Motif scaffolding. Sequence first.
Motif, PDB file in Angstrom:
ATOM      1  N   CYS A   4       0.843  -1.193   0.000  1.00 53.11           N
ATOM      2  CA  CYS A   4       0.000   0.000   0.000  1.00 53.11           C
ATOM      3  C   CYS A   4       0.881   1.246   0.000  1.00 53.11           C
ATOM      4  N   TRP A   6      -0.080   4.256   0.558  1.00 51.13           N
ATOM      5  CA  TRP A   6      -0.767   5.320   1.278  1.00 51.13           C
ATOM      6  C   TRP A   6       0.114   5.849   2.406  1.00 51.13           C
ATOM      7  N   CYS A   9      -1.284   5.048   5.711  1.00 53.16           N
ATOM      8  CA  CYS A   9      -1.509   3.616   5.886  1.00 53.16           C
ATOM      9  C   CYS A   9      -0.214   2.879   6.233  1.00 53.16           C
ATOM     10  N   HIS A  22      -7.874  -4.566  -0.173  1.00 52.30           N
ATOM     11  CA  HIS A  22      -7.589  -3.800   1.034  1.00 52.30           C
ATOM     12  C   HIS A  22      -7.899  -2.319   0.825  1.00 52.30           C
ATOM     13  N   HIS A  27      -9.940   1.596   2.258  1.00 55.42           N
ATOM     14  CA  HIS A  27      -9.781   3.021   1.966  1.00 55.42           C
ATOM     15  C   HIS A  27     -11.000   3.623   1.271  1.00 55.42           C
TER      16      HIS A  27
HETATM   17 ZN    ZN Z   1      -3.833   0.869   2.834  1.00 57.61          ZN
END
Ligand code: ZN
Length: 64
Positions: A4, A6, A9, A22, A27
């Motif tokens: 990920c 992010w 994240c 996920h 998200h």
């Molecule tokens: Zn994530």
Amino acid sequence: DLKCKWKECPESASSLFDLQRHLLKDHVSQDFKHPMEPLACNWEDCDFLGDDTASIVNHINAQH
Ligand SMILES: [Zn+2]
Ligand SMILES: [Zn+2]
């Protein structure tokens, strides 16, 4: 092994599919009650936009 990208994240994925599910589920819960409100990428630097969550997941896997 999907990672990920992010900033807010701290979780990683085990497979390319893992991040898709996920990111899509985690998200973006998706209310599914919008009459005409297209979805947009939720990345800090990304300005990607799509018509549906599926369009994003396709972009996320390719671009993210
Ligand atoms: Zn994530
Ligand atoms: Zn993006």
